[PDB]
């Protein structure tokens, strides 16, 4: 995130970090067993890290759960990034608690001009 601000710790409780030794992508928790992410973030093995704020320091609210299934959209196009969406099944259900929580799927598309919140551990 370039030009952003530091989120208040655990104020984005649906945000997860995808880790294969180190952080490489984000994701969103949509029920206790499933994270939605981007298909170009695919790796054969992924550890999902929930409840994170500082991804380098153990703070006490983390849950580290390895993926059991990783399902990319069948019509993903790796050249154009069309259909860039992926679902990750956790090998055990996350424990949902004030710092680890789900985000709702949309009931309709957002109108142009709608203000949104974007978050991540990407380059600043």
């Amino acid at each position: 995130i370039v030009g952003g601000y530091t989120c208040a710790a655990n104020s984005i409780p649906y945000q997860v970090s995808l880790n294969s030794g180190s952080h490489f992508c984000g994701g969103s928790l949509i029920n206790s067993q499933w994270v939605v992410s981007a298909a170009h973030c695919y790796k054969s093995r992924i550890q999902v890290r929930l409840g994170e704020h500082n991804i380098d320091v153990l703070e006490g609210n983390e849950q580290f759960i390895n993926a059991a299934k990783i399902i990319t959209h069948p019509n993903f196009n790796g050249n154009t990034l069309d259909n860039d969406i992926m679902l990750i099944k956790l090998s055990s259900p996350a424990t949902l608690n004030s710092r680890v929580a789900t985000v709702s799927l949309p009931r309709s598309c957002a109108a142009a001009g709608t203000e949104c919140l974007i978050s991540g551990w990407g380059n600043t």
């Binding site: 030009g3 530091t6 994701g27 985000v103």
Partner: protein, 98 residues
């Protein structure tokens, strides 16, 4: 875990959904119906490498997934996001059967 370039602390950004016309004008020939642009045509504020897969949440609803862009925070090159309101049935049916 943050390695050499990523921040340690989770970062946040408020940004507006942009019109479909502005999105296609910024990225001629590259925008499908499964993509939305979110951000600032003036540049300066954007998602970037390491953010892919993460959320764009509007009025409490997941509307975008960080996907791609030309550079980061460049003028007339806002972030391009997977359009989540195209995929609720794919998401629900995949979860229901797996």
């Amino acid at each position: 875990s943050s390695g050499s370039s990523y921040p340690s602390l989770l970062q946040c950004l408020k940004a507006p959904v942009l019109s479909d016309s502005s999105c296609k004008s910024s990225y001629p020939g590259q925008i499908t119906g499964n993509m939305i642009c979110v951000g600032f045509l003036e540049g300066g504020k954007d998602s970037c490498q390491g953010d892919s897969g993460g959320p764009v949440v509007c009025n409490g609803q997941l509307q975008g997934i960080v996907s791609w862009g030309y550079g980061c925070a460049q003028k007339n090159k806002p972030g391009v996001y997977t359009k989540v309101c195209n995929y609720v049935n794919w998401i629900q049916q995949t979860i229901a059967a797996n």
